[PDB]
Structure 1
Amino acid sequence: FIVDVKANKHQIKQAVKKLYDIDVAKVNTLIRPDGEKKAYVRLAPDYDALDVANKIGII
């Protein structure tokens, strides 16, 4: 994810959860040289990324 740069992990976590009715194991953020905050979000093992990609439309 690209994320709004003032975001914390507990905000990114209660975001990604709220929306793609998902749940999140851990968040892990950097700031791209460009100012865009990335955040790559591990999803709990019961629960797949490759499915929730197609829901959110990416792939």
Structure 2
Amino acid sequence: FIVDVKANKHQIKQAVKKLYDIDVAKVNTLIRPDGEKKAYVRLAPDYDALDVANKIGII
């Protein structure tokens, strides 16, 4: 995902859990040279990222 610069990793994972009802393993964030905050969110192994991506609509 990409988020605004004010979000913590805890805030990001809580938001992901609420909006997409998926458990989250960890989060890695970096502020991109454009300016936003790219966040790599690794899920719990018992969920499937490809399935969640199809559910959200990106594929």
Please say whether Structure 1 and Structure 2 have the same fold, judged by a TM-score greater than 0.5: yes
Gaps of 5+ in 1: none
Query: How many Å separate the matches in 1 of 2:9 and 2:35?
Result: 17
Q: Which has the higher strand share?
A: 2
With the length of structure 1 as denominator, give the TM-score of the two structures.
0.97
Q: CA RMSD in A?
A: 0.5
With the length of structure 2 as denominator, give the TM-score of the two structures.
0.97
Q: 1:39, CA displacement in angstroms?
A: 0.4
Secondary structure of residue in 2 paired with 1:40: strand
Runs of 4+ in structure 1 deviating by more than 3 angstroms, as ranges, are none
Secondary structure of residue in 2 paired with 1:28: strand
Q: 1:4, CA displacement in angstroms?
A: 1.4
Number of equivalent positions: 59
Identity of aligned residues (%): 100
Query: How many Å separate the matches in 1 of 2:40 and 2:11?
Result: 13
